[PDB]
Amino acid sequence: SGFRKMAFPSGKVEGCMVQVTCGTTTLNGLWLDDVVYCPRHVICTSEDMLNPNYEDLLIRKSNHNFLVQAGNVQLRVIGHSMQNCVLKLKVDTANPKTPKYKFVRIQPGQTFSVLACYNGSPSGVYQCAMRPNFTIKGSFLNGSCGSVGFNIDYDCVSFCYMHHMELPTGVHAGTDLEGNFYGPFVDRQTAQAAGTDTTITVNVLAWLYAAVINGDRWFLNRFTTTLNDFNLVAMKYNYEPLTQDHVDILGPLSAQTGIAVLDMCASLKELLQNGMNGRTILGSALLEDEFTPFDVVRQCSGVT
Amino acid sequence: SGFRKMAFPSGKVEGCMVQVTCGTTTLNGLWLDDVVYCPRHVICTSEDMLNPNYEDLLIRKSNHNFLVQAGNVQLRVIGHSMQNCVLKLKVDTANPKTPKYKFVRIQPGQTFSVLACYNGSPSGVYQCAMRPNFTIKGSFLNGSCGSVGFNIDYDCVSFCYMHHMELPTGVHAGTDLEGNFYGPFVDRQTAQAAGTDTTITVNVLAWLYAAVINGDRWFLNRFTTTLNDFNLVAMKYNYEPLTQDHVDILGPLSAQTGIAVLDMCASLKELLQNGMNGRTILGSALLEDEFTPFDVVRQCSGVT
Ligand SMILES: CC(=O)NCc1cc(Cl)cc(CC(=O)Nc2cnccc2C)c1
Ligand SMILES: CC(=O)NCc1cc(Cl)cc(CC(=O)Nc2cnccc2C)c1
Fold first, then answer.
1. Domains and CATH numbers, chain B
2. What residues sit in the active site (chains A, B)?
3. DSSP for A162-201?
4. Count of A–B CB contacts within 8 Å?
5. Is B125 close to A8, i.e. CB distance below 8 A?
């Protein structure tokens, strides 16, 4: 028993982290096979960052201008190319620690582990979610760019995120491993609207199932609701509309606890309308939305 | 910016995890050098666990009865011994992935990362604190015994905890790497009083400094307090008494933000007496006590 915001073990990813330096800028790179992936703003100076012409900036750079260091050993760069907002640096050596991996574009509401890195070295690992507005509420400082988000299935690391920037609002923006930003964000120092964020309804319900599994049951009630009535409440409280697909993904949790999804929705409805009344659920005084139904099942069953 | 419950990167510890089987019981072991450390209840059966005579149970076991598997390879056991509540299995091979390490007995209120494991394989990593009552509020299931807690300083892994059991109250108990339980707990199936827990006052103040650093300042007020007046409030709310040593450890955070410790105590006092009023601090609706002042400095400065 017990429920924690658990991250995947970071070992397979620690072995891929490298430091990439170009000109005066140093950030993190991801070494998989003979390729190092890193944000393309590594080629910019502070003056360049207001409206950088990346194509022009990259033209002034040669393979020898990108300094890639893995721990203490220097990697030899034999090719460079830009794909969307990432640079792909071909190196003459395949990373001997390359795990089985995939590049995936996660959906908003999905979660992943982030290995925060500075100068190619890891500092910590934390679990987070891609917000409905495509930002991530992370913990990142200057030099953390190039840190990656990932998931792990048995032996395969699915890389889903690469950190690029912090918005003026303190939230974080980045790309998939093909360099496509999640959201409307561009890699330039300009005003950027993050957009209205909502609460991940299906995740809150999953976390309510995790609470029941771990003995926290005070919020269960004698009521039920319908998808339409629950969605009127979700609208009022900036919760994502719950769909039949969400109800279906909650099936395993509904089967394990014997609490129908719509009965759990009525608990969520009462909690939204009345609050916690000074009480807690799984050590939290607010409704947690950074656990997917899959995360709850994985943690409550002990999948390694 | 941003503040997260961040764990240390788990790689150095993943490389030490092994599976230990004895009789019908399988749990996790920690392979450092030519020694595998694991909970001594690995030698018990379910009937034995009510009042096990460990010395007698271990006498019926030989080196060949302890099956130690590292990934997919079997380790040869050449010695076995019991030290307090841990078994030390000498193996004929030193772990090639043994990091630089120390065995440390952490103090209550200190934090550490836990690498939860099942059958010698890691499932996740989370940050937690040794509660003042010497329990840990973790996420552990059957088979997680032997999972370890640790801290990392540059290249040295300080092992501080080994998971042994779950109390009937759902909280977790375990030992240092010498087999000494933290707290009054014994490794037997009996009633065990966890004892009154308190809130780690110095950690809440550190987290209040982290909040100011990251823009959350709504709780700052026009008031100050004294150590004695603040401690009367801490008593009333089951908060640990704040001492001059705590004030001193908060010095770096006080220097960085320019907010005197006693002024921050007056903010904490007002928050304890009036609550959050439906607001949040660093995404939390309650006062967080699982970040030490050192954790705050490390995260806010990006130490790798
Ligand atoms: C406001 C802003 O940062 N816009 C321009 C911009 C656009 C890009 Cl592609 C990159 C950067 C640097 C950057 O944001 N780094 C960073 C990352 N995470 C935490 C803290 C920092 C300082 C800056
Ligand atoms: C109530 C109780 O567990 N007492 C006896 C006892 C004492 C000891 Cl040394 C060990 C065990 C097993 C045990 O608690 N395992 C476990 C660990 N973490 C999470 C879930 C589980 C089931 C059992």
1. 1-14+100-197 (2.40.10.10), 15-99 (2.40.10.10), 198-301 (1.10.1840.10)
2. 41 (for 3cl-pro activity), 145 (nucleophile)
3. EEEEE-TTS-EEEE-TTSPBSSS--SSSS--------B-H
4. 153
5. yes
